[model samples]
Target: TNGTMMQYFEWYLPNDGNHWNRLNSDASNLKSKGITAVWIPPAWKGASQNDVGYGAYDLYDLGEFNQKGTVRTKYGTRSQLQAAVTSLKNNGIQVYGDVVMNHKGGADATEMVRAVEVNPNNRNQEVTGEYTIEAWTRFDFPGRGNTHSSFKWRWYHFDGVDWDQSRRLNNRIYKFRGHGKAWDWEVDTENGNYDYLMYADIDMDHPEVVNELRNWGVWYTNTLGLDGFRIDAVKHIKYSFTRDWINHVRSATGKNMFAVAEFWKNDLGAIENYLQKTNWNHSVFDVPLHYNLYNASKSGGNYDMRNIFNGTVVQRHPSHAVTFVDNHDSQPEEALESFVEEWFKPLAYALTLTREQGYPSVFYGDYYGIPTHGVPAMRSKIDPILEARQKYAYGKQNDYLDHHNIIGWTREGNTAHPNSGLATIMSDGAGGSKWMFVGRNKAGQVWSDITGNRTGTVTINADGWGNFSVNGGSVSIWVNK
Candidate 1:
């Protein structure tokens, strides 16, 4: 199946707690639009109701508990979320839950703990002497008193924190010296110890913490009927722990949960290293691939179209790559803002969706548009590529990635999908044509440009070759009509 996943949230989703029900209303429409999976925003209670799901405070409170001052999250209530999931499943669409496991925010209580402040720039050096400071690491879960699990969190449950209640602010990685806790190993080496992100970083090395996370995974999976997971910030978490957590959940539930981690570094080497350390359990977002597309998009006609996939995780490790054009973190005004230029979006979508390489994920911000931010919806441009993916773009593939300005590929249709074979030609520079082989069986067959970029049809010769035309700085798909 040519499956497609959608992120399903922009950073600016209103906190009206109706997004899930709204999605439920549009389940059939999304299914018909060729969406196989929907990656909803973090359903759990965040630091606040307005928080965009990342500042997760309580995992069990999926908008059911009034922990975060509201019985609803940025998405919706627990019952509404469950209904949306059921509706999506009934429509043959898989529901991937976003899991935020790196850190927790919005604690209910504070505890005095001894911690040594390490430099934020260099976590290896101690900046301050060991002293007792008030840290907000206690989570009593007053809103959810043993509703699901009796697990309670304290200062020992976390590895480090940034702020001390009495002391205005401590912009240092204070590894809790309360219980002689050390930073978890097998994590990113940034700042000497990249394990600390923000808020209270969970100590994955702690056996109790690990066990609780695994147990939570089992409960969440069974309760939500989660088809998969979108792991938030894997690079900061211990790799072995993440692998164990995922495998343990899979083992307990007997479900092959498709997991994708957010390792948001621009370095391809870092991604490869993480994959190696984790033993390739989860797919990673291709950050380098997005940058390559970004560079090409900004290069006008100077970029070599043939080298689009160069240095990409998809280019090397295709199966482990989750190709995306832009996501919430990449959207404008966000912390990790790197939204793709609007002009190159259509070509980028075509590259990811039409190609048989990576697991392509479309961002909701791009599809529905960020109405709050004045960004127009891209369905008019993106729907065609998605439609092409569902209908054509199959069978034996052939690459014509030879030209510097123009390149193309052809797919021979299979018996299962008749007349589904297609020729995709794209040019980053000037409008050009590629004499690509369609198929010996397609000889004398006429193909039309489904992209509507080319007005006329291209007829294959006796040798099954056609000069497929594409617009400059654009792409066109020639399919048998």
Candidate 2:
């Protein structure tokens, strides 16, 4: 079965300024766990600000170990990254980088002025080719435009309750402040402002934008030799442009280059509509699918996979979509985050490793209490789930839904759940057609209280479905037998 090999990586910034030097130790640890791939956070320079680092400043943030101060940020030093990369490689781990390339950063005039003064010889205008101003967006964004807009007592794009705009933003239901200086796309990317800015969606359809991104993508990957890339915020970008961009990268990186996108629409039809446009058939994240998971799990704990995974999603795009219960985006307010009451640490991870969808990005990590704000201690013990995935060789994900309380099929065999490898299940409704023959391979029919089987089966269960359970308290595995 041997399919349980994929892994998720949280982008890390080292304590030191060396991005290259910080990856080894951690990569080695994951390798020891039999993890094969990791998805790191945005490495490009962040807003040159945001401690959260998600706000990003310069694409240059990947950090240059060869130059002094070339690497500096939350993830540590270039040396650290180098170490991490090397360690992972030596031990057979692949790395997927989360790259943000939507827009330039929002550097104010003050920083620009100071930069010019400090380095007269540099003429530093890599960002806008000029200094920044209080006005960030060119979109005429109300509160942030050349003019000011307000709501309540605070400056806002509009007054009270514009639910439409608020819905898209993560920080509460806030209205869109006109798109002005900040809204305008900073056409001055050559200056090297690698950070992303919130502004007009990039016109990648423009040859200039497409060419720039393509070149940038090739340079970054070739320079870093990363295993893959998880494209961010695709919904905002034009689908046409997105398709071009993906095609460009595929041509540049060649095959074996994994490319996944975050097109956040919670409807399978919506996702399927976009799928035709995205060249990424192998790893498009199932944003729509997550909604089902969150709602089902919340509709009450009694909710099962059979109920949540309903739809032609399994019938339509099982091979392409990536599945997950929670992500950096989904874990807030009413979604997966609400589960804190369950004390069900492994439930989320169990979903990732067990589901038969795109590559399952295991969350609920093996370890918890290792806060996202402060990781390292992150262990969740869904080891058996990952093991089961490995035993199945089911990386070629196909939909296998219809079981309540169960999240359904997996990415062939990619997580620890079925890592041993197995025969893939077909999404055609014939239950046993895709059973993973893992019992003799990865898991030797071990006893499991939940499914009441020490060993899993390659044949269908009495219920005409693939069924197995993770141990109640500490363990969860995606048994494909």
Candidate 3:
């Protein structure tokens, strides 16, 4: 069965607390459009009502208590989130909750702790001797005291923090000094040790911290009935923690949850190393492929279309590659802003959707448009491609990746799906044609471009080959007329 995932939230979604209701109303529509799974934003309470859920505050407070100056999260109340998940599940769509377990934010109070300042560029090198620093690491949860769990956080639970109340300074990385305190070694090698990202970095090596996180995982999964998880900031967390956490969650829930981590690195080797370190337990976002698409989009016909998949996760580890074109981070004005050009969106989507490898993730901003950023919806251009993925992208594939500017491929229809064959051709430079074989069984079948980029139809010859045509700097998907 063919399945597609849609990231159901964006960076700036008005913060009106109606996102859950919108998803509840649009579940059926999303299912009809071939979106089999939805990756919902973090449902927990963050720093405030509009903290975007990344500024993790109270993991147990899923918009239920009067914490963070609001009862509801930026999305909606806890009941609304449950209803939306139910709706999506009723429509036969799997729900993947975005999990942020690396750090916690919006503490209730500050505590003085012995710490040392480390160089930001290299966290291993100490810049200053041990000294007392007031860190905001206490979490008594005054709003929801012992409502779900009584596991209160303190300064000792964290390994580092970005802010120091004593100095009133925001530009520093202070590492806590105590018994068995050190940056995690099984983390990204970038910046010496990429153990700390932002906020209060949770000490994953601590037994109590690990137990609390695991308990939260089970509680969250059962509470929302989540079918999968979108793990956040994997590069910054310990590899062993993720591996053990996922296994523990799955074992405790008795459900094989589909998990994907956001490594956030463009290097394929680093992602591969993480995958190997975790024993290939889950998939990762294809960051390298996204960069390739971004570079190709900005090249203005200069990028070779033939080498599009080179140095990409999908090309190297297709099974563990969750291919995506754009996401909240990569959209305009965000931290990792590398938005793919609009003109090449259709071409990029076509490649991800029609390809036989890698699971495809459709971004919500691209489909529904980013009204906050004046971005228009691409439904008109992407709908046909989605339909193609649902109906025609099946069976044996034939690659025609020969030309520098133009590349083509064919998917011979399988017996399970009737009339499912399709030929996809794209051009980064000038328009051209490529002779590709669809099938010898259907010699006289006529094929027309479903993408509406080309006008004429291509007829298959007796040898089962047709010269597929594409417009200049465009893509055309030819299917049975």
Candidate 4:
């Protein structure tokens, strides 16, 4: 289970149409750097050639159709994408496809549908009586030409739409409420019902929609050879549908495809409830923990370092928690923009990479630098941490998270791994030291700070205890090399 993932996109990356070929070139380099998996950007054709794949136009078109303005997407053509995926797999790195099933955009046709206007603030409260409205709820792929399936989408297949052709400036959520159609249940509690996220929300309760999606999942897996999926906006979708979809795909393909969902909430209780409702079938990004890290980074030594993991899903639900420092949402100018300070990034990485709890993921923006955002690549700072994790961080662990500004932990070396043990110390205030035990078998061994934040070395006493030192507002990883 020594898997590590990297989310390989920033919102403002260039649309150069050469990303796929670039990925193929960097496959072996990334694999040697300890990245086991990569979650690439959305690959399907979008509303426009530069739509970034979220504004989905045709799911069947993976840059293969000449429908959208250009046959090649922002990344590249479908053939280039396939080559990149193959190169990555050949280099021993798994690929996770970004799945966005919440909505569809760029409808080819319109339909007069019966709908009721619901309050945008509270979708459960109806604002107007049932009325017939013209909505862009019909999709007929021109370029695709029903090559995959003849499943044409209509208003009945959607749960809601934000805009109507008659009222072009409307902001109300018009729920398609006719012929026994209603909002699906078992979703997030926000806005009374969060079933409508953006564009035309797919009605997951419809049997045809469900079956088509399952069939598409099979096609997507076989076509792209996906090892897993990174699900987007799960909080607004039907919880049961996601669970059933993932389980169905796994059962049908007979592969334990790894999946992670984005709940986008800082409340652990809601996250726990969602997980419970979904039967814990998929992992979720630890938003609460990310918030905690963000707040602590800006605290300027006032935050309690001991409670860093408090109220976090990783602390209670470690197995289902995907710990991450910063991602696309956390980048500057995004909706979930809560950027962790650069000064405290090393400490945050240490906590996530060295811990034995959650499955940690490194953000591509942080690893390769977001030039448009003025953030430089942190590869030099992170490579050491990755090396430490791959070499040491194993066997028994002992935590010293008892201080408000300074904390440390130790990992006893496993016999199978030679010198596979380390003691990590960090401080948010004045510099301090901790007396921690590396291992009883490590008696008389010498250890040094591998992060290069602190100088000198420490010798373990006969009792296997060593005094580890770290600089103020920094972290030091003591490893016996």
Candidate 5:
């Protein structure tokens, strides 16, 4: 079973509370295009209707309570989200909800607490002694009125906060001081210790905090019937908490929940370490491969096509690698902006979709255009690639990674799926041809380019080898015609 996933939201989508309805209506079309799974945006309420769900205010408020100055989240109400999930599941597609458990924002009340100022450049060193500061760490959830969860978050539940209302100062990292208060040592080593990212950093070391999060995980999964999770900001959270939390959710729900963490690190070693620490429980987005595609697009024709996946996670740990070319963070003007050039998108997709290694994720921005950033829709270009993945990308693969500017591979037809074989050739430099073997089953089968980047066709010889041709800086996916 060749399954593909699609990230179904963009960062700048209009905050009209209609995203769930749109997904509910588009379920069949997505399934028709071979999208077996969808990674939806965060369903919970954020700081406001426009917070994009990253600035998590209340995990229990999935657009049901009248908190955040609105009854429904930017996406939709809880009923609408449930309806969308039900529709997607009915249509044979798994729904992966985006889970943001790194920090909390927009607390209901402020509390006075003893804290010390730490150096922003290096959080391991303290700049000031323990002092009193008014921090917004109270979350009574007055609007929800303890309907779903009565666990009210307080100052003790968090390790740090960036704001101090008593001092009326900004641009500071205040580390709370108490009996067992300190930044988690298992977080990323960036900035001396990257335990705190933004807003009020959740203290995973707290017993109550861990239990509350685990309870929310089970509640959220059972409530929405989610099949998987798209974990956000893994690099800043405690590694042990992530691993244990996922395990708890799976054990409680009795479903082998598929989880993919957004580690957001381009270094392969850090990713490998995270996987090892977590016991390889979940897959990780291939950030290194994304950077490689980004660099290849920016290099015009100078980037070597053969080394495109040299330091990527998919090349090293294909079983736990989720390959993606772009996402909300990597879109044009977001925080981690590394948008691949438009011309190379087809080539990048061909590499991901037609290959045998790693699961591929298609970004919604690329499929339906980011009108906010003046980017056009790539549906016309990507639809064929999705179709090729559904029909032809299967069976044994033969690699032709001998040329620097040109590279290719072919999939021998499989028995389960009829005519499920393809030959893919791409070049970052001038156009060229590569002689790759598809199979020796049928000698005279004619194959044509489904991407339409190259004209004409290639006829398979008696030896099952065909010379596949591609245009300059383009890709060609050849399948039986």
Candidate 6:
């Protein structure tokens, strides 16, 4: 079944096992209200003392205590994470974890900088070889030795901004107005850093980093048995880097695992560039779907369904893309996301779960038991399509027929279970009758109207055509034999 469609950022992880246990308790409470998965944040290492996980100084902190991400950062301990996972599974909820691999705390440099002592051999900065990318062809920061002379110490960005106010010798300088020596190793990736630094960059081309990531995946698999992974800032790294990482992890796990890369582009044409490069096992977050859904819901009702459903094909292999409505990154801590309640969010999710090509996720923040801003509070329980997926096998797809904005799909055939086949159809415009069609593979009474929780099977006419109103962002589904 579809679970909470979630986002980026780690909720404040509790110290002991209490937090996870609390989240698990709250998840059950949300199930009654309709929440399915507890889309948990990653428990990777964080800064040593200043904490605030995500910036890892020492990898052992991923589950170790000195810092929260080290088992001390923001989300709490390994025990707490495991407890939360166990609690959710016991309560019939699935968990999706965010995976951060592009870079870690080395770029942040705070902990490492502070930890540097009088010993040169024991410096926190490991004996790492320095290399820079060919300019323009690839986007990269400046290196200490990229230029000569103290006056030319600054670096310029392709975006046409030099960040340095003055030139400094043998020091990181911002030649591009957007970069400053202050930003030398500051700010997180895609965080829109103009002149700030938070950490150093990871050379994905580095074998050491690669080995570490593989081990992390192994640990996560053996520990949490996570249902899936959402890749962070996919475009920031080389496509080859992510592809190899996915393959390596999948090979090591030896299980049906899913990895979703966040291409972030909402337009189909731009996103296709990245999609073509990825294997079926690595899915791109359907950003285009989100854009279409937002527009459809605001205009009367579900208008984007026809166009996006027509555009986004299910069944990309190795793995299927995951679709969702609201995530952590879209809004900030100050925003009350759970209350926004974009009515069309449900419709968008319906299209996600019932459309058989990719895995579907839900943001369970509306379940009401979670803190509007607390660790577990971000999860909700209001979406019904989540339950529908479990009840009707919404994601199990047998086939699909498309006609421009209008589309239709069928469920797996199971004669043994007569009440099986699930079907759905959607149109982009309200000009036509807005309706959903469903059916079971069983011969006698094949389809059913699932929206009404009744039986109705969809049958194609002699012309091999089905009718639906497709356009904008809208969706409809039916389940029954």
By lDDT, the best candidate is 3
lDDT of 5 by residue, 1-481 (tens): 7889999999999999999999999999999999999999989889999878999999989999999799999999999999999999999999898998889999999999999999999999999999999999999987899898999999999999999998888789999999899998698888899999999999988999999999999999999999999999999999999999999999999999999999998899999999999999999999999999999999988888889999999999999999999999999889999999899998899889999999999999999999999989998999999999999998998888788889999999799988789999999889989989998994799999998887798999999889899998888999995
Deviation (Å) of 324 in candidate 5: 0.6
Full-model lDDT, candidate 4? 0.90
Clashes of each: 0, 142, 0, 0, 0, 80
State the displacement of the C-alpha of residue 426, model 3, in Å, after optimal TM-score superposition: 0.8
lDDT of 3 by residue, 1-481 (tens): 6889999988989889999999999999999999999999999999999989999999899999999799999999999999999999999999999999999999999999999999999999999999999999999999999998999999889999988997887679999999989988699999999999999999988999999999999999999999999999999999999999999999999999999999999898899999999999999999999999999999999998899999999999999989999999999999999999989999999999998999999999999999988889998899999999998999889999898899999998898888888999999889999999889986999899998888899999999899999998899999985
User: 3 or 4, which is superior by TM-score?
Assistant: 3
Off by over 4 Å in 1: none
* Residue 221 lDDT, candidate 4, scale 0-100: 85
Report lDDT (Cα) of residue 347, candidate 2.
51
Candidate 3, residue 395: Cα displacement in angstroms equals 0.9
C-alpha RMSD by candidate, in order: 1.3, 12.1, 0.9, 1.2, 0.9, 11.0
| Candidate no. 5 TM-score | 0.99
Candidate 2: worst 10 consecutive residues by lDDT?
A: 109-118
For candidate 6, what's the RMSD? 11.0
User: Least lDDT summed over 10 consecutive residues: which range in candidate 6?
Assistant: 110-119
**Candidate 2 on 294-400: residue-level lDDT in tens?**
55545544555455456535435777766654565544332224322133434545555555544666542224322445433335344545655445435444454
In order, candidate lDDTs are: 0.89, 0.45, 0.94, 0.90, 0.93, 0.47
* lDDT digits (tens) for residues 206-233 of candidate 6: 4455576677676666668776677766
- Model 5 ranges with Cα > 4 A deviation: none
